CSV table of C-alpha atoms in Angstrom, one decimal:
chain,number,residue,atom,x,y,z
T,1,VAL,CA,0.0,0.0,0.0
T,2,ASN,CA,0.9,3.7,0.3
T,3,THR,CA,3.1,3.3,3.4
T,4,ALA,CA,4.9,0.4,1.6
T,5,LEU,CA,5.4,2.8,-1.3
T,6,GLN,CA,6.9,5.5,0.9
T,7,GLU,CA,9.1,3.0,2.7
T,8,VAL,CA,10.5,1.6,-0.5
T,9,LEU,CA,11.0,5.2,-1.9
T,10,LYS,CA,12.9,6.1,1.3
T,11,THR,CA,15.0,3.0,1.0
T,12,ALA,CA,15.8,3.8,-2.6
T,13,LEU,CA,16.6,7.4,-1.5
T,14,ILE,CA,19.1,6.2,1.0
T,15,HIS,CA,20.7,3.5,-1.2
T,16,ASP,CA,20.6,5.7,-4.4
T,17,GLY,CA,17.9,3.9,-6.2
T,18,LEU,CA,15.8,6.8,-7.6
T,19,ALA,CA,15.1,8.0,-11.1
T,20,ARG,CA,13.1,11.2,-10.8
T,21,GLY,CA,11.6,13.3,-13.6
T,22,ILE,CA,10.0,12.2,-16.9
T,23,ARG,CA,12.9,12.0,-19.4
T,24,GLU,CA,15.1,10.2,-16.9
T,25,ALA,CA,12.2,7.8,-16.4
T,26,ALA,CA,11.9,7.3,-20.2
T,27,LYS,CA,15.7,6.7,-20.4
T,28,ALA,CA,15.5,4.2,-17.5
T,29,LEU,CA,12.5,2.5,-19.2
T,30,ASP,CA,14.3,2.2,-22.6
T,31,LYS,CA,17.5,1.0,-20.9
T,32,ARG,CA,15.2,-1.9,-19.8
T,33,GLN,CA,16.1,-2.1,-16.1
T,34,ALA,CA,13.1,-0.2,-14.8
T,35,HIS,CA,10.9,-2.1,-12.4
T,36,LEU,CA,8.1,0.1,-11.0
T,37,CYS,CA,6.8,3.5,-12.2
T,38,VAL,CA,4.2,5.7,-10.4
T,39,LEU,CA,1.9,8.1,-12.3
T,40,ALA,CA,0.0,10.9,-10.5
T,41,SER,CA,-3.7,11.3,-11.4
T,42,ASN,CA,-5.9,14.4,-11.4
T,43,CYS,CA,-3.2,16.4,-13.2
T,44,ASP,CA,-3.0,18.6,-16.3
T,45,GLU,CA,-2.5,15.9,-18.8
T,46,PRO,CA,-4.3,16.4,-22.2
T,47,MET,CA,-1.7,14.0,-23.9
T,48,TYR,CA,0.6,13.0,-21.0
T,49,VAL,CA,-1.6,10.2,-19.5
T,50,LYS,CA,-1.9,8.2,-22.7
T,51,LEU,CA,1.7,9.1,-23.5
T,52,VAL,CA,3.0,7.5,-20.3
T,53,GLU,CA,0.5,4.7,-20.9
T,54,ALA,CA,2.1,4.0,-24.3
T,55,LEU,CA,5.5,4.0,-22.6
T,56,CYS,CA,4.4,1.8,-19.7
T,57,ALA,CA,2.0,-0.6,-21.5
T,58,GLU,CA,4.6,-2.8,-23.3
T,59,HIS,CA,5.5,-5.6,-20.7
T,60,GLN,CA,6.3,-6.2,-17.0
T,61,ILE,CA,5.5,-2.6,-16.0
T,62,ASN,CA,3.0,-2.0,-13.2
T,63,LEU,CA,1.3,1.2,-12.1
T,64,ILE,CA,0.6,3.1,-8.8
T,65,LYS,CA,-2.2,5.7,-8.6
T,66,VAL,CA,-1.3,8.7,-6.3
T,67,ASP,CA,-3.7,11.6,-6.1
T,68,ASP,CA,-1.7,14.7,-4.9
T,69,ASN,CA,1.5,15.7,-6.6
T,70,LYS,CA,2.8,17.6,-3.5
T,71,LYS,CA,2.3,14.7,-1.2
T,72,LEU,CA,4.3,12.2,-3.4
T,73,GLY,CA,7.2,14.7,-3.5
T,74,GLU,CA,7.8,14.2,0.2
T,75,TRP,CA,8.5,10.4,-0.2
T,76,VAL,CA,10.9,10.8,-3.2
T,77,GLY,CA,12.8,13.5,-1.3
T,78,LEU,CA,12.5,16.0,-4.2
T,79,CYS,CA,12.8,19.0,-1.8
T,80,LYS,CA,13.5,19.3,1.9
T,81,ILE,CA,13.5,22.9,3.2
T,82,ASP,CA,13.2,23.7,6.9
T,83,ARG,CA,12.8,20.2,8.1
T,84,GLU,CA,11.9,21.3,11.7
T,85,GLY,CA,8.2,20.4,11.4
T,86,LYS,CA,6.4,21.0,8.2
T,87,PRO,CA,8.3,21.9,4.9
T,88,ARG,CA,8.2,25.5,3.7
T,89,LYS,CA,7.7,24.6,0.1
T,90,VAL,CA,8.2,21.3,-1.8
T,91,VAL,CA,7.5,21.2,-5.5
T,92,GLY,CA,5.6,18.2,-6.8
T,93,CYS,CA,6.8,15.7,-9.4
T,94,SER,CA,5.1,13.4,-11.9
T,95,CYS,CA,6.9,10.1,-12.2
T,96,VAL,CA,9.4,8.1,-10.3
T,97,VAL,CA,11.4,5.0,-11.3
T,98,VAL,CA,12.8,2.9,-8.5
T,99,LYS,CA,16.0,0.7,-8.4
T,100,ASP,CA,15.4,-1.9,-5.7
T,101,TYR,CA,18.8,-2.9,-4.5
T,102,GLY,CA,18.2,-3.3,-0.7
T,103,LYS,CA,15.6,-6.0,-1.5
T,104,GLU,CA,14.8,-7.0,2.1
T,105,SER,CA,11.6,-5.4,3.5
T,106,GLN,CA,8.1,-6.6,4.3
T,107,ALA,CA,6.8,-3.5,2.6
T,108,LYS,CA,8.4,-4.7,-0.7
T,109,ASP,CA,6.7,-8.1,-0.4
T,110,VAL,CA,3.3,-6.6,0.5
T,111,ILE,CA,3.5,-4.2,-2.5
T,112,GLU,CA,4.7,-7.1,-4.7
T,113,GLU,CA,1.8,-9.3,-3.6
T,114,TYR,CA,-0.5,-6.4,-4.5
T,115,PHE,CA,1.3,-6.2,-7.8
T,116,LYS,CA,0.9,-9.8,-8.8
T,117,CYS,CA,-2.8,-10.0,-7.9
J,1,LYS,CA,32.6,50.3,-16.0
J,2,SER,CA,30.5,51.7,-18.8
J,3,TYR,CA,32.5,52.5,-21.9
J,4,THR,CA,31.8,53.9,-25.4
J,5,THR,CA,31.6,50.4,-26.9
J,6,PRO,CA,28.2,48.7,-26.6
J,7,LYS,CA,27.8,46.0,-24.0
J,8,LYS,CA,27.6,42.3,-25.1
J,9,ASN,CA,25.4,39.9,-23.3
J,10,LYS,CA,25.4,36.1,-22.8
J,11,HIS,CA,22.9,33.6,-24.2
J,12,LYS,CA,19.5,34.0,-22.6
J,13,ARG,CA,18.4,30.5,-23.5
J,14,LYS,CA,15.0,30.0,-25.0
J,15,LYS,CA,12.7,28.0,-22.8
J,16,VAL,CA,10.9,24.9,-24.2
J,17,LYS,CA,7.8,23.5,-22.5
J,18,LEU,CA,7.2,19.7,-22.6
J,19,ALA,CA,9.4,18.7,-25.5
J,20,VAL,CA,9.4,15.0,-24.6
J,21,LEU,CA,5.9,14.6,-26.2
J,22,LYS,CA,7.6,15.7,-29.5
J,23,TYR,CA,10.0,12.7,-29.2
J,24,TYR,CA,7.4,10.0,-29.5
J,25,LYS,CA,4.1,10.2,-31.4
J,26,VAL,CA,1.0,8.3,-30.2
J,27,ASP,CA,-1.9,7.0,-32.4
J,28,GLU,CA,-5.4,5.9,-31.5
J,29,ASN,CA,-4.3,2.2,-31.4
J,30,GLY,CA,-2.0,0.4,-29.1
J,31,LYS,CA,1.5,1.0,-30.4
J,32,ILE,CA,4.6,3.1,-29.6
J,33,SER,CA,6.6,4.8,-32.4
J,34,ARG,CA,9.9,6.5,-32.8
J,35,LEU,CA,9.7,9.8,-34.7
J,36,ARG,CA,13.4,10.5,-34.9
J,37,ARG,CA,16.5,8.3,-35.4
J,38,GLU,CA,18.3,6.6,-32.6
J,39,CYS,CA,22.1,6.9,-32.3
J,40,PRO,CA,23.8,3.4,-32.8
J,41,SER,CA,26.8,4.2,-30.6
J,42,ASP,CA,27.7,2.0,-27.6
J,43,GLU,CA,28.0,4.5,-24.7
J,44,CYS,CA,25.8,6.9,-26.6
J,45,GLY,CA,23.1,4.2,-26.5
J,46,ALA,CA,19.4,3.7,-26.3
J,47,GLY,CA,18.5,6.5,-23.9
J,48,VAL,CA,19.3,9.8,-25.6
J,49,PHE,CA,17.7,11.4,-28.6
J,50,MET,CA,19.1,13.1,-31.7
J,51,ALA,CA,18.3,16.3,-33.6
J,52,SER,CA,16.4,17.1,-36.7
J,53,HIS,CA,18.0,20.0,-38.5
J,54,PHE,CA,17.5,21.5,-42.0
J,55,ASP,CA,20.6,19.9,-43.4
J,56,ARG,CA,22.2,17.5,-40.9
J,57,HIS,CA,21.8,15.0,-38.0
J,58,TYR,CA,23.6,15.6,-34.7
J,59,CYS,CA,23.4,14.0,-31.3
J,60,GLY,CA,23.9,15.4,-27.8
J,61,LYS,CA,27.0,14.1,-26.0
J,62,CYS,CA,28.7,11.6,-28.4
J,63,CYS,CA,28.9,14.1,-31.3
J,64,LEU,CA,28.3,12.0,-34.4
J,65,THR,CA,27.3,14.2,-37.3
J,66,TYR,CA,25.4,12.8,-40.3
J,67,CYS,CA,24.2,14.6,-43.4
J,68,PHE,CA,22.8,13.7,-46.8
C-alpha cells in the first residue's frame, strides 16, 4: 500500500535507487532495467496520461495511482527545506522509477503481492 | 565600467515546455513509435535522442554528425 510505497521510496533514496523526472524515467525504461513506475492522477495531462500509458504498457511494467503531486514529492525527497516540522515549500513531481537494491523489506513483499494480484 | 563600446550579453536560452511529447508520437491504437532516429553508438546508446535540423543530423554528448 501507500506506506509500503513511501518506505521503498525512502530505501531507494538512502541506497541511491531513484530516477526522478520524466525523461530520466523514459531513459531508464528504454534502458530496460526499470521495475516500478508511479503516475500521478488528477493532473494537467491532455496528452501525457496516454503518452505514459504508451511507454508503460509494453511488458512487465506496473502502475501506482497517487492523487496529490505535492504529497508524493515528500516520499521521493524531491525537496526538503526547513525540516523542523512542516516543509516550507516542496514542489511536486510526476513520475518516479525505482531501483530496488536493498531487497529486504516486508513493505516490498506486500507491495509485490499487491502487484501480482 | 561603462565605456563607449556597446555591451555584449550572454545567451539567454529560449525555454521549451514539454518537448518530450515531441520525441514519440501516439496514435489511436496500441503501439509506440519513434519519430526520430536513434544513435547506434555503444555508450551513446538507447536513452538519448538526436536532432532534426534542416541539413544535418547531430546527437547530444557523443557528437556523431550525419548529413545527406
